[PDB]
């Protein structure tokens, strides 16, 4: 009845002892941390900015960083050592304004020491320092992206307005890792007002440095090759009478099939990430947001009609279900009647007898018309099984925000009401088989590897921890047949004229997608192409190029891959010197 009271008397005794111990800590162990120089000097506390991490690719080429922005501000209009400043600054006069104004922004590293000797520590001439994100090797915005200050809605989440929030596809995924801890310090201020001693109370974390799987070499090649496609897009649209439409819409992805690393990813019309970052309020960036086009969205992750590229998966599902043996016989006629309407072929004359290898090679559509006509109602559901198995329906595992790729099933059309004549258009990719170039680039990487389904990832190393790649295998009984037909397309199919005489034995397939708008001759230019089919001493590579309404995938997309492939394996041009 009394022992419990002794405990509370002991509890409140040790509690006041711990308070006495915590006080002694601050008073005795930390008095050097709170010295006042034997005078009435007050103490101010100021937070320390957080150095955001440095985004750089493999081999150490910096792609993003932040440093100091040194400006010259002066108020009053005093001479000081004016005779030496005018030739150094090149202004030849001091514009006398009432409000504080800036002279020579972005002071270089050589002018700063010379100015500092002439600063003289006077009240008029000082050097304000600012933090701004700097991209030394800027990469396509829709992939790399931009940086803005903390929004009003984000401020309530505990972010200071001096913090930088990245809405970027790449900088948002890395934002939790890149952000450093905003430290806090306290400085002894004299009666005069001078700095005397700094005291660190929260050591700032300088963020983490992410190493990407991108290569700056292949990245310039991708963005470059997007522009010569415009010269070919305008050339193709010229034969149709449609306007030149010089906008360079589309994107391109180039990755490693084995390790699942992405080596080159770009979109267009991309922007410059330094615009949103450094300047306080750039007006040109405001027009980018109100753009009628899509200059910020990455077309590598948005759903588009795949067309003849999806037929490579149609043949896969056709071989795994057991519909056709690798040595079947079908004549690629010019016309085929499903029973309701005539299914048109891309050509106009008889091609001859073909196999699965010959069907993919010459991209025959009448093959997949006859082959699916056996079981048109049950294959479409089984088609999406293998399609989602290859990596077309689900997500790629990219750090950048990605859009949903819609695959059609009988169940989907019921919730959207199904007709049998839709299967043939779905087998090639007309029936709303929406897919993204990122997913499309992965579908080729699985077949090129022959079973492995690697996960795409831009990041190679966050901080110092090497991110390990995650694999997954798919059940494939006949892979070589799909691989031969892909090189048979380069050796004898559509890519005969571009990559036939090419040194590295490449396989792939061209793609054109009848646009749903009007189907007026401007299709979606597609082409996929993986690395050395034969065991030549070259590292593997998969490249996929897409162009909105570019048309003639053989004429627009195929050369774009030839350029990126040439940059990867170092293919020399007319260099006889």
């Amino acid at each position: 009845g009394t022992g419990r009271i002794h405990a509370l008397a002991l509890f409140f005794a040790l509690a006041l002892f711990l308070l006495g111990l915590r006080a002694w800590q601050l008073q005795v162990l930390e008095y050097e941390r709170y010295a006042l120089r034997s005078q009435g000097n007050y103490l101010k506390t100021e937070d320390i900015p957080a150095p955001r991490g440095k985004i750089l690719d493999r081999k150490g080429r910096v792609l993003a960083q932040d440093r100091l922005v040194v400006d010259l501000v002066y108020t009053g209009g005093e001479v000081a050592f004016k005779e030496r400043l005018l030739p150094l600054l090149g202004l030849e006069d001091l514009p006398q304004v009432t409000e504080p104004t800036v002279l020579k922004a972005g002071v270089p590293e050589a002018l700063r020491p010379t100015l500092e000797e002439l600063t003289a520590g006077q009240k008029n001439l000082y050097l304000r320092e600012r933090i701004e994100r700097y991209y030394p090797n800027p990469i396509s915005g829709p992939v790399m992206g931009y940086v803005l200050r903390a929004n009003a809605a984000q401020v309530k989440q505990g972010y200071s307005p001096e913090e930088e929030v990245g809405q970027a596809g790449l900088e948002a995924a890395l934002e939790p890792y890149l952000r450093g801890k905003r430290g806090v310090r306290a400085v002894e201020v004299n009666v005069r007002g001078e700095r005397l001693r700094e005291t660190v109370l929260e050591e700032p974390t300088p963020g983490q440095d992410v190493v990407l799987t991108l290569d700056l070499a292949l990245q310039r090649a991708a963005e470059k090759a997007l522009e010569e496609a415009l010269a070919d897009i305008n050339a193709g649209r010229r034969l149709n009478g449609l306007p030149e439409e010089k906008q360079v819409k589309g994107a391109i992805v180039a990755l490693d099939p084995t390790t699942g690393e992405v080596l080159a990813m770009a979109s267009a019309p991309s922007f410059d990430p330094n615009l949103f970052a450094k300047r306080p309020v750039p007006e040109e960036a405001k027009a980018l947001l109100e753009d009628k086009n899509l200059p910020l969205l990455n077309r590598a992750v948005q759903p588009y009609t795949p067309g003849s590229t999806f037929k490579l998966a149609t043949s896969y599902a056709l071989l795994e279900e057991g519909y056709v043996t690798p040595a079947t016989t079908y004549r690629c006629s010019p016309y085929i009647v499903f029973g309701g309407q005539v299914r048109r072929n891309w050509a106009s004359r008889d091609m001859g007898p073909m196999t699965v290898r010959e069907a993919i090679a010459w991209s025959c559509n009448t093959w997949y018309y006859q082959a699916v006509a056996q079981d048109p109602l049950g294959f479409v559901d089984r088609l999406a099984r293998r399609a989602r198995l290859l990596g077309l329906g689900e997500a790629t595992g990219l750090e950048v925000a990605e859009k949903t790729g819609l695959l059609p099933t009988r169940a989907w059309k019921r919730e959207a009401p199904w007709y049998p004549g839709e299967t043939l258009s779905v087998a090639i990719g007309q029936g709303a088989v929406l897919a993204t170039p990122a997913q499309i680039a992965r579908m080729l990487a699985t077949i090129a590897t022959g079973g492995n389904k690697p996960a795409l990832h831009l990041v190679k190393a966050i901080g110092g921890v090497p991110v390990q790649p995650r694999w997954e295998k798919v059940p494939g009984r006949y892979w070589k047949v799909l691989q031969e037909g892909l090189r048979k397309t380069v050796s004898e199919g559509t890519a005969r004229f571009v990559l036939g005489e090419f040194p590295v034995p490449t396989g792939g397939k061209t793609g054109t997608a009848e646009t749903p708008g009007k189907r007026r001759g401007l299709e979606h230019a597609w082409y996929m192409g993986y690395g050395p089919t034969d065991g030549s001493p070259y590292p593997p590579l998969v490249v996929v190029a897409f162009f909105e309404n570019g048309g003639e995938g053989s004429r627009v997309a195929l050369p774009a891959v030839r350029k990126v492939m040439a940059a990867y394996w170092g293919i020399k041009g007319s260099l006889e010197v």
């Binding site: 009845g1 009394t2 419990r4 009271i5 509370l8 008397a9 409140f12 005794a13 509690a15 006041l16 711990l18 308070l19 006495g20 915590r22 006080a23 002694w24 601050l26 008073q27 005795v28 930390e30 008095y31 941390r33 709170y34 006042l36 103490l43 506390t45 937070d47 309530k156 989440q157 505990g158 200071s160 806090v184 306290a186 109370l201 929260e202």
Partner: protein, 336 residues
Amino acid sequence: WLAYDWGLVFLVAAIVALGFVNLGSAAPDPVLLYRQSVALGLGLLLAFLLQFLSRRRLFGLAYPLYGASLLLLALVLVVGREINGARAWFVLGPLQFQPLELAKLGLLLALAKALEGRPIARVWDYALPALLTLPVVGLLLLQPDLGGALVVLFGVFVVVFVRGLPWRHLLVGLFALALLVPTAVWPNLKPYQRERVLIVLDPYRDPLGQGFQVIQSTIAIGSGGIPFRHTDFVFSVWAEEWGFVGVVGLLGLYGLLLARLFALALACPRLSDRLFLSGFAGMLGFQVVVNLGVALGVMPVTGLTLPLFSYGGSSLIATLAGLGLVLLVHRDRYQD
């Protein structure tokens, strides 16, 4: 009859003495020193007037004061004044009163007279005190007042810790309650509220915790010899000006104060006197260790002043009126 414990009275006087002394630098406004001086006169006269009562009459109004305190905690949310985001006062001009003081002094008596009987330890040990505590805290969280509710919940715990003592069942009950409630509030907590609570645990966020972080630096200024407020941070003003050799003197008096409170609590033979004097010393000590813990950068900010040092229009009177009831039940410990 002059049968009190003057050692307890001297410890009270020695700290209120430094109270006005520390209010020389803190709150130097002479208009403030006047309303504090007249608060001591009314605080000492009320405690002098409370001595003209018997212990039986004191415990005869346990349920009346408890039931009346609930009427005030339910009325303060209608015709009260909002000082800092919560209506918890009655100010009709020259009057200053808080319904939370009568709730503490009323719940201490009510839970001492009631728990004098047998508590059913199996299940209903935490039934009657729970039924008498939730109406109090419930009418405090609707103000809202988190600091005042923690003093209430700690005082009720002390009373149960003296009579009930369900040690095996009590600790396991707290561990479960301390894991299920956060698992329910955190998902339903807003980002405005989630960050708010995270800032309470870790005080390193300047725009709200700069002054409170400055307190930790302000205290450590002087050793061996601008703050946000003079109320919630009397000790920081005092600890900074008086160095460390003083800090032990204040912690000493408060240590000796809570000692004689518990000491006289043992001299009383009746159970309800054990409960009432333990719940009072617990309710008073809990404020000190929390107030000084906030100042020393250990306890999270709760918004509770430090007795015998804080500037209080009714808080000083209520604490002195609380100390008078302690000296009342002590001289009445023998007689019935």
